[PDB]
Amino acid sequence: AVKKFKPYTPSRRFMTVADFSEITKTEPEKSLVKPLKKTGGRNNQGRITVRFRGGGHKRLYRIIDFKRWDKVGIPAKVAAIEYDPNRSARIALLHYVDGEKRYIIAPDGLQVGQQVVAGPDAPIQVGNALPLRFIPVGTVVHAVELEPKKGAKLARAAGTSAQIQGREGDYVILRLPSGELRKVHGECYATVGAVGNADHKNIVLGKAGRSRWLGRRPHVRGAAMNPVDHPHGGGEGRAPRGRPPASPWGWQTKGLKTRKRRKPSSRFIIARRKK
């Protein structure tokens, strides 16, 4: 669902907060697999490289497992589903019969008490992770690797996933969260199921703070500035741009493609996007 409120204050008649039911079962993170101060900071060596970041609530970083091939064959029971401030998805804390404890980005439907496991003989079912080439084509999977052993990179945001469309040589073909058709090596590990907390995208912030709480500082439009500041600056009394819509740096911003042309990464991508 999603929490609604009665309009007892303006803005409160609009904000909605996540339904923390899937979560629950645990609040404080696992002191062991989380001790990692998250280094905050909106720019590199002194200079701001990403405008409007900063402020925002303090955060501990939960280190998660983006490559499960480590523990091939060792089963693990799902201990808890927790909240993770650094991602759209929630995470599942799991207890390996091994003793070892790990955090997985919690898949949709993965319940506490269930058992998961990785490897080529993993029983195709939500939670388990296997090398793509061992998963039944048509299977919806998430946290897919893009190149064998380099870690999970595709389909990780709340409620996302990819579907295996076909096999072909050492390569299998995926339909990414973006609608794009990509060829990804058959050895790339992926874990069965969709990401979960797919309701994420519906929460309405409701007010200017909250945006501040998430660490997003106010974004000032180009038109609101002077020429020294941005191409859309200046003009006496509200201007109409001036053709053509461009960024504060100069590159046109309506439709101009930015993907590097001669990129070898092409070839492997068949389709493009959703429109």
- Interface with RNA includes 251 (CB under 7 A)? yes
93 phi/psi in degrees, rounded to 5: -85, 125
Question: 238 is in the binding site of which of RNA, Mg ion, none (Cβ under 5 to 8 A by kind)?
Answer: RNA
Residues 169-208 as x/- pattern, contact with RNA by CB under 7 A: -------xxx-x-x-----------xx-xxxxx-xxxxxx
Stretch that binds RNA, among 44-52, 133-141, 163-171, 185-193 (CB under 7 A): 44-52
Residues 61-90 as x/- pattern, contact with RNA by CB under 7 A: x-xx-x------xxx-x-x---x-xxxxx-
CA distance 182 to 145: 12
Looking at beta carbons only, is 228 or 238 nearer to RNA? 238
Among 110, 130, 132, 155, which residue interacts with RNA (rule: CB under 7 A)?
155
Among 25, 101, 167, 185, which residue interacts with RNA (rule: CB under 7 A)?
101
Dihedral class, residue 74 (left if φ above 0, else alpha if ψ from -120 to 50, else beta): beta
Pairing of strands 101-105, 91-96: antiparallel
Question: 163 is in the binding site of which of RNA, Mg ion, none (Cβ under 5 to 8 A by kind)?
Answer: none
CB 113 within 8 A of CB 79: no
Q: How far is the CB of 31 from Mg ion (least distance, A)?
A: 8
User: Looking at residue 202, what DSSP letter applies?
Assistant: G
Question: 29 is in the binding site of which of RNA, Mg ion, none (Cβ under 5 to 8 A by kind)?
Answer: RNA
CB 251 within 8 A of CB 257: no
User: Looking at residue 134, what DSSP letter applies?
Assistant: G
Q: Quick one: the chain helix, strand, coil %, rounded to 5?
A: 5, 25, 70
Torsion from C-alpha of 21, 34, 101, 201, nearest 10 degrees: 30
Q: How far is the CB of 209 from RNA (least distance, A)?
A: 7
Contacts of 164 (CB under 8 A, 6+ apart): 132, 135, 136, 137, 138, 139, 141, 172, 173, 174
Looking at beta carbons only, is 111 or 247 nearer to RNA? 247
Note the residues at the interface with Mg ion (CB under 5 A). Answer: 45, 219, 221, 231
- Interface with RNA includes 6 (CB under 7 A)? yes
Please give the residues from 118 up to 147 whose contact with RNA meets the rule CB under 7 A. Answer: 146-147
Stretch that binds RNA, among 37-45, 121-129, 163-171, 185-193 (CB under 7 A): 37-45
Among 105, 126, 129, 164, which residue interacts with RNA (rule: CB under 7 A)?
105
Question: 270 is in the binding site of which of Mg ion, RNA, none (Cβ under 5 to 8 A by kind)?
Answer: none
Looking at beta carbons only, is 21 or 226 nearer to Mg ion? 226
Neighbours of 95 (CB within 10 A): 16
Question: Quick one: how many helices (H) and strands (E) in the chain?
Answer: 1, 12
92 CB burial (10 A radius; 0-12, 13-18, 19+): buried
